[PDB]
Structure 1
Amino acid sequence: VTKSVLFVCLGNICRSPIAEAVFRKLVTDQNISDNWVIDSGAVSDYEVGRSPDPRAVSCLRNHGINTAHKARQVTKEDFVTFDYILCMDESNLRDLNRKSNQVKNCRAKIELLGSYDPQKQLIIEDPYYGNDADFETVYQQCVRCCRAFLEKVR
């Protein structure tokens, strides 16, 4: 039975298009992409329709990964469609949990991506007003945590 994950952050231009791209490369590498539906979403308005930040693009490229995602907001139907909704920080979590209450047949489990890190760096911090090394951190956190998540639910 096919499974589904939706990665989320504030804007869907930095962290979650990275997490989505990382997870997609993992499942493909493991020859299991047929068993997964994967996407990324924003809590916020700020970047609807835009491509990921240049910094995320170049970081991904450094690791041999490309994305074609356009920024989109999370919807009520997302809470019914996805098996897991994995978010980056405590604001995101709060926001998501509040929204899921107005959705009557909510099925998704809503959790911090960081909760799966074997290294226990629970928070994936918003790198918008930082530099290339902060993008790199976020990419490494993503790799650790997606690998652990897939071990546990594959």
Structure 2
Amino acid sequence: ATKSVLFVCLGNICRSPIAEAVFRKLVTDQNISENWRVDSAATSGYEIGNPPDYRGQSCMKRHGIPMSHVARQITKEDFATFDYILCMDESNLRDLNRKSNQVKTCKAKIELLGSYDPQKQLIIEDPYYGNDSDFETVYQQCVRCCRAFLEKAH
């Protein structure tokens, strides 16, 4: 049974592509990437076609993680095909819940990625108006949450 997770933010250039690349590293290094469909997407259309924020890329390169992604907006189909849709903050969640109610088939469990944090940091804050340290915090949160989600899904 092939499992799937979709990481979601507003733009799909900062937080979600990081979480996605973090997770694809986890499963790849445990020999199970073949068992996982992994992706990320945006609630809005602002960044469509764009690569990840360069600051996020630089952060990912310091941790030696390849991050290669073209921003895309979430579709009605994503709700039917993904087992899990994990977002970053409360407005993401509100948006996703909104879209999920326009759809016939919602297989996806929609949750904050942070609800998996062992350290109870619910929200993964947007680093967009911040600095490198803010990107680093996001990365560390993703590692914690992804590692926990991979072990045991709600």
Q: Indicate whether the TM-score tops 0.5.
A: yes
Q: Which residue of 2 aligns with 1:137?
A: 137
Q: Which residue of 2 aligns with 1:4?
A: 4
1:84-99 residue pairs with structure 2 within 5 A?
A: 84-99=84-99
Q: Which amino acid aligns with 2:89?
A: D
Instruction: Provide TM-score, normalisation by structure 2.
Output: 0.98
Q: Which residue of 1 aligns with 2:78?
A: 78
Q: Is 2:59 the partner of 1:59? A: yes
Whole-angstrom distance in 1 between the partners of 2:152 and 2:73: 28
Displacement of 1:149 in angstroms is 0.4
Q: Which residue of 1 aligns with 2:102?
A: 102
Identity of aligned residues (%): 83
- Please, what is the CA RMSD of the aligned residues? 0.6
Q: Which amino acid aligns with 2:23?
A: F
1:85-141 per-residue CA deviation (whole Å, 9 max, x = no partner) reads 000000000000010001011110000000000000010011111100000000000
**Structure 1 unmatched runs, 5+:** none
**Structure 2 unmatched runs, 5+:** none
Displacement of 1:46 in angstroms is 1.2
Give the number of equivalent residue pairs.
153
Q: Which residue of 1 aligns with 2:146?
A: 146
SS at match of 2:38: strand
Whole-angstrom distance in 2 between the partners of 1:106 and 1:150: 21
SS at match of 1:69: coil
Whole-angstrom distance in 2 between the partners of 1:145 and 1:47: 25
Q: Which residue of 1 aligns with 2:42?
A: 42
Instruction: Provide TM-score, normalisation by structure 1.
Output: 0.98
Whole-angstrom distance in 2 between the partners of 1:76 and 1:97: 12
